[PDB]
Design a protein around this nucleic acid. Structure first.
Lengths: 108, 25
RNA sequence: GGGGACGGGUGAAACAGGAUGAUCCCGCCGAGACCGCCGGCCGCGCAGGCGCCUGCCAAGACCGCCUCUGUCAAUCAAGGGCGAAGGCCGGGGGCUAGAAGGCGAUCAGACACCACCGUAUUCCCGGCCGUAAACGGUGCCGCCCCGCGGCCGGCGCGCGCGUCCCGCCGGCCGCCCAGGGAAACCGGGAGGCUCCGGGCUCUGGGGGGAGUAUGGCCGCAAGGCUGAAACUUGAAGGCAUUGACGGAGGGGUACCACCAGACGUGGAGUCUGCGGCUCAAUCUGACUCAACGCGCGCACCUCACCAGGCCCGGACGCGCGGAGGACCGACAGCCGGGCGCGCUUUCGCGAUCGCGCGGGUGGUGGUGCAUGGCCGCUCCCAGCCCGUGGCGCGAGCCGUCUGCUCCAUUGCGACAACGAGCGAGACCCCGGCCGCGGGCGCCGCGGGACGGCCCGCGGCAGCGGGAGGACGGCGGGGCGAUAGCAGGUCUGUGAUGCCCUCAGACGCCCUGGGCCGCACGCGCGCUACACUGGCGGGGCCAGCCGGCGCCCGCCAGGACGCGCGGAGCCCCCGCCGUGGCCGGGACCGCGGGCUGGAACGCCCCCGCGCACCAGGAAUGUCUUGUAGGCGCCCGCCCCCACCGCG
């Protein structure tokens, strides 16, 4: 019955997206200091902070294991694929359909 | 089937009514 | 023929069948039905309907066609034929099933459902009947009609070629764009229709009365077909929406639910509340959950009730009266718990007023069905809604999920919705561990615990273990959505509508009794029913949070003084020895005391020694420091608790 609620989940997800670098995968205690940081978020009350940091530990372990909150640190690789043009184009290089139009490719 | 049972009661009364008519014919 | 005790039946049963050998097995015969699995978005037929084999006999649609004819057509009163089943009337036949009929269980009844037996019937042949939710609830002929699929038949085109591909025609169907409709839905029409006209027949005109009466016809009948009125009534109906509900299904879920247990009540005395009743008065309110030790302890008071009494606490304003007096008490004697209450009586007062009125003022009087406020309850519920957009003529839907996880609309990955909220969380008090600060009293602020970690299984959400760690996944509580309820309180309230009462008051006092009276039925508790126990000593352990010394007395209590203090259970030794006993303590007979103006309250001692020897049918509460056992505190409190808060 310890199901992290959306309030805990929404805050935790934003914190990993904002500072993936600050967090660490197996350390709730480091995450608690990052989460408690006055600049990172203003969490009223100890329980919400403790839980949000616990959710970041699981989320951080997940977002390090795989791209499971977008990762700009991973977006560059996606952008590189977006600009990627194969040097040798596989497709630049039924039979009588062209003969039918009038211009015959593979004539004969 | 109340409609069916109602027409059976009407048919019974109509049999008795015709028979009584015959006695006084 | 075999082999040996049951068999049938059912939801369980029971009846009928079994040593005259059943059931069961195997062969054999007879009798009559009936066409299994293939068997269908298959087909044929005018519908009703239609399925064994081999024939036999006439058909029928469809297709194909440079075949013939030349409007021969359509729809149809009357008229003719056909028509499931059940029924009928003559003949058969007779297995099965089976209205009636009989039985056997059930139930208050059951005569109904379920079982068992069983006649008409079912089957055939010749007649009759003429009806079905005879439905596709949609007449028939004609045209246009948007795509997409299946299936049946006939034919055609094309090719590798196969029961292929693509058509066409006639059917049988599904899905739908338009359109239509009040919608459900039709869409091969229920479209092309308020922009209404292809043709032709049938029927309808609010609901009953009533398909009845009567008349006709038809039938062997049963009945069919036709078919009213008088009169009654403000609705009947259709299709959808939302709730409430189901002995409907699918998820869940909770000791206010059950498992597995516990500890019980109900049974006995008692104690408190309620009903009934008795009464001068027994003030009442409340009646499943959600009335009933409840509305925080009834000598008086309270206090609303009675049996008697007292007086204004009728203000402030207009007219009128009034200083020798407006107002306003009093000795003695009387009468009367008592009151200059009244009286006989003679003595004052001192403008603080009388008198009517305009109007107050109070009233625990009523009505919580006129109400505020609070509070119970639905609900220990997870639901509740919004902005814009989508959908419908609208009521209303969508977001708000028929997928998964939670303790939870708790999340996640979705989705004509997309964003917001509110509730749950969060929060806050009180713990249990660790710092520091503080100490007239162990009291002031911080940490720690997060499903973080491990091993799994997991889009996920998580979950299932393993831990480490005072502490584990919801320690315990406070707050507790929305929409409501004719829930309860006018007897908490310078809360309050409105009526009643208002000077002999429903104002207010004073007295004594009432609420506690008991033929009764019941709810909450307490103490019992003993040896796991009493009883006599000896130790002695608490929290909420709180003081005592000295002497007198059997205690009870009191006097005196002053600064402070503390349980049971349990443990150790004795006695009883299964006896209503040394279980148990109920009334009553005294006695001694307290609080008290006052017992009608309480206390203690000496008698007494009530039922109950473990509570019927029924039901209640309850999961770790938990139930229960065991005491203490505090509330209302003059005194008092078996009660409640703890």
């Amino acid at each position: 019955g310890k199901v992290r609620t959306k309030t805990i989940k929404r805050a935790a997800r934003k914190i990993v997206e904002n500072n993936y670098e600050s967090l660490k995968p197996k350390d709730f205690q480091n995450n608690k200091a990052i989460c408690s940081k006055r600049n990172v978020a203003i969490i009223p009350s100890k329980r919400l902070r403790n839980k949000v940091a616990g959710y970041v530990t699981t989320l951080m372990n997940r977002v390090v294991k795989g791209p499971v909150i977008s990762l700009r640190l991973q977006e560059e690789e996606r952008e590189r694929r977006d600009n990627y043009a194969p040097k040798k184009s596989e497709f630049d290089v039924t039979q009588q359909m062209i003969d039918s139009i009038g211009f015959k490719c593979m004539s004969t | 089937m109340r409609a069916k049972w109602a027409k059976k009661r009407m048919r019974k009364l109509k049999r008795k009514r015709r028979h009584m008519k015959a006695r006084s014919k």
